[PDB]
Amino acid sequence: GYVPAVVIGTGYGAAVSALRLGEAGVQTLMLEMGQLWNQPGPDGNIFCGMLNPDKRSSWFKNRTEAPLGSFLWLDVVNRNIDPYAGVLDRVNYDQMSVYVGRGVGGGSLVNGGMAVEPKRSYFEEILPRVDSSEMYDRYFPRANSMLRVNHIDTKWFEDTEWYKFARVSREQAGKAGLGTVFVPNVYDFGYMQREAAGEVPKSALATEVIYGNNHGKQSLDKTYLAAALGTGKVTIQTLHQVKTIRQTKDGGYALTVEQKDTDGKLLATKEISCRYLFLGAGSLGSTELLVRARDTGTLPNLNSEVGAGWGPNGNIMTARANHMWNPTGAHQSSIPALGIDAWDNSDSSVFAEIAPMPAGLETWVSLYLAITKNPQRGTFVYDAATDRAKLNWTRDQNAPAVNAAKALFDRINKANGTIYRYDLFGTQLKAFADDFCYHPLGGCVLGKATDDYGRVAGYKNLYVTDGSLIPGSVGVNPFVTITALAERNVERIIKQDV
Numbered sequence: 001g002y003v004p005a006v007v008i009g010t011g012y013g014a015a016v017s018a019l020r021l022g023e024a025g026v027q028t029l030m031l032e033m034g035q036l037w038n039q040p041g042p043d044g045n046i047f048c049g050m051l052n053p054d055k056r057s058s059w060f061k062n063r064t065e066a067p068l069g070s071f072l073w074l075d076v077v078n079r080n081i082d083p084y085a086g087v088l089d090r091v092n093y094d095q096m097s098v099y100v101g102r103g104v105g106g107g108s109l110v111n112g113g114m115a116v117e118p119k120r121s122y123f124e125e126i127l128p129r130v131d132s133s134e135m136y137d138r139y140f141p142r143a144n145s146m147l148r149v150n151h152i153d154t155k156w157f158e159d160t161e162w163y164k165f166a167r168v169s170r171e172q173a174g175k176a177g178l179g180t181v182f183v184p185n186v187y188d189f190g191y192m193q194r195e196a197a198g199e200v201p202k203s204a205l206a207t208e209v210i211y212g213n214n215h216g217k218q219s220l221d222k223t224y225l226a227a228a229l230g231t232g233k234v235t236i237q238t239l240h241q242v243k244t245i246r247q248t249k250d251g252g253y254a255l256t257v258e259q260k261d262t263d264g265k266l267l268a269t270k271e272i273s274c275r276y277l278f279l280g281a282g283s284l285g286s287t288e289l290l291v292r293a294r295d296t297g298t299l300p301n302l303n304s305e306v307g308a309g310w311g312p313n314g315n316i317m318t319a320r321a322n323h324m325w326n327p328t329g330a331h332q333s334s335i336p337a338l339g340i341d342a343w344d345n346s347d348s349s350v351f352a353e354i355a356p357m358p359a360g361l362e363t364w365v366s367l368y369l370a371i372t373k374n375p376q377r378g379t380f381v382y383d384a385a386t387d388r389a390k391l392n393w394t395r396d397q398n399a400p401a402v403n404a405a406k407a408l409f410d411r412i413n414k415a416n417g418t419i420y421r422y423d424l425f426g427t428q429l430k431a432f433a434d435d436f437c438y439h440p441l442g443g444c445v446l447g448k449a450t451d452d453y454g455r456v457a458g459y460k461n462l463y464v465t466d467g468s469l470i471p472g473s474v475g476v477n478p479f480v481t482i483t484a485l486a487e488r489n490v491e492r493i494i495k496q497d498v
Ligand SMILES: Cc1cc2nc3c(=O)[nH]c(=O)nc-3n(C[C@H](O)[C@H](O)[C@H](O)COP(=O)(O)OP(=O)(O)OC[C@H]3O[C@@H](n4cnc5c(N)ncnc54)[C@H](O)[C@@H]3O)c2cc1C
Pocket: 008, 009, 010, 011, 012, 013, 014, 031, 032, 033, 034, 099, 100, 101, 102, 103, 104, 105, 106, 107, 108, 110, 111, 112, 113, 114, 115, 116, 210, 240, 241, 242, 243, 280, 281, 282, 283, 285, 286, 289, 438, 439, 440, 466, 467, 468, 476, 477, 478, 479, 480, 482
């Protein structure tokens, strides 16, 4: 049937859009391909942890996989599984694996919660057509407030065993003249302090994050989406995957949608139409829908920028072997609290997450997710044979990201007399993981595939709201930027179009 507004997906862009539509009185249907994560599993918990993965961990895989960096210790717990509508997907392109969340809340279910604003100078470089004053004065503050961003108690951080890993890297970075910053988070740090005191059920302190947090993490289902549902104008249909979009004869949109069960079986195919269509299917999902629509002729007016300008936010993972006298601890909070800030907007820029190691025993390893400034971009093209958008990206294109990461961590190693680990990512001498990302950005870039508010070029009442808008990089963990842009965009769209 017909609904005035449809929002595809339930991640950051989608959730912002749905809340503001509902508040404006617009009846809105969100279509999410994954599950609503609210039914207890076989252990009485919603989500599995990283030391007890099961089919809930993985979107339609036949074996669980260790969190990147932890294979040497966590492979022992990983198991064959039945393919299931689990929470974390690995999308494997030819030379890049992109991790994404699947469920009501999207990547907010599985992410590390780091809620970071980009440097304004870098924001102005990447998005010069956008008014940066409105972003920093209005929309970033709005996003942080709605997301329930909070800050760690710095005295507790200094004292607690659970952040020894972060203090070690801080000290090591300092010897090399590099500073660290505390990173705000949507995980409730007061709750985390109570976990450490044995006062509340553990989640961050029980090796949970990447397959969901059973407690503590304020994912979108608790924040924007709960508020959207509260308007009485928003519905969410789960296990509904949008396959196609077309323009209708009177200028609306019609979607073909597959309803599945949690085992992946097809239950129904539906056509849903609307006046206003908002894409929040993520960098991969929104881009794929639009590339397919363009190249199969169902949205033939889409421009050639649809599909272009993809990047992995410069993501590179690496690890250092600490001296014996600098153990990182058996007990490591699963939520990062510190980053190394070596981002000066030059091509040597690095902002590096100090990431925890979920082994549950002492490994002496420090793990880092580096975010770099690498101008290389990939492109999604349509493959009519498989009916899929394929990402054209080669591993060579991450050479500049590897080089920036390596320059920074070589500096830290030289200052401390330490070496890399080379054995964390498989059976190859490899210190830098250069073919994954957690932060896919672009494919439907703001101002190129769309106007400066995410209105898709060639069409009226058709909007993109999500990470596909961002031009490949933001220099920090991206969800705060996605949220803030979405707030800006939907405010304008509702005012001027709806
Ligand atoms: C392991 C990991 C760690 C991360 N850590 C951090 C962090 O600490 N801080 C940070 O800032 N960022 C982090 N990120 C990145 C962050 O989660 C993403 O940038 C953000 O979730 C992207 O938001 P989005 O709205 O673009 O899309 P998503 O959050 O990816 O949501 C897209 C939604 O659309 C659904 N969907 C897709 N296609 C369809 C379709 N055709 N039909 C119906 N539904 C569809 C998906 O199932 C999903 O629920 C992390 C991500 C991962 C995977």
